[PDB]
């Protein structure tokens, strides 16, 4: 019944892709300052999703993880093309609370178990990109481009069996949309796993988060809707609490310039 609000930042070469509209920041495209800003206004957890193309990706992600852990105190996940145990191991040891895998786990589900055996299930996030194909939810890999022919219902069960800690459920059918989370897909997955389910893609307004939690999501992740300020994070948490959703609010408070405190 406790619910989580997460912000995700897509990063390339240590930069926020397409930036943000927070001109109060010294550099609105710097993922550490943006991430620290989110942790101060009330985001519960962060995801840093790297799309660095060329041969610099591994070093780039280790450098990001290093800088994030030194400045940021809320949990964060790194993801985006993490392909084996040694890469994931390096990133956790460098300071990431959680590592997210997708394509590599679909192709080699043993990878889930290998990470969880050393670092515990709570360190493992599996991102599942799913799409309706001929009346069935399917799993897509390679940045949503490869139909694996694997059914979502089968993969969710296998992901829990292999030892993942939580699932991010990203609806390709909502990619870039603003009409709501894929609540039908969330409801479809909810009876199939006891793991935390994190909704991703489709958020356009505050009411969409309420819908996702009524559908059984344990957490809701968004990116552009926060970065370009269509939704204010504190306003969202106040709205959710007002309508009965158990979000984390008492741990915040100081954002209205209330007198002074030395």
Residue numbers in the entry: 2 to 263
Sentences from the paper on this structure:
Computational design of KE07 involved construction of a theozyme to catalyze the chemical reaction, which was then grafted into the scaffold of imidazole glycerol phosphate synthase (HisF) from Thermotoga maritima.
In contrast to the improvement in turnover rate across the first four rounds of mutagenesis, which was unambiguously the result of reduced activation energy due to changes to the local electrostatics of the active site via mutations within and near the active site, the catalytic efficiency of R5 and R6 is improved by more favorable collision frequency (the activation energy actually increases). Thus, the mechanism by which the remote mutations that appear in R5 and R6 increase activity is qualitatively different. This is mirrored in their location within the protein; in contrast to the initial mutations that affect the active site directly, the mutations in R5 (Val12Met) and R6 (Lys146Thr) are remote from the active site. We also solved a higher resolution structure (1.61 Å) of R6, in which the active site of both monomers in the asymmetric unit were observed to be fully in configuration B, with the imidazole ring (an analog of the benzisoxale substrate) of the histidine tag of a neighboring KE07 molecule in the crystal lattice bound to the active site. The anomalous KIEs observed in R5−R6 correlate with the increased sampling of the alternative active site configurations.
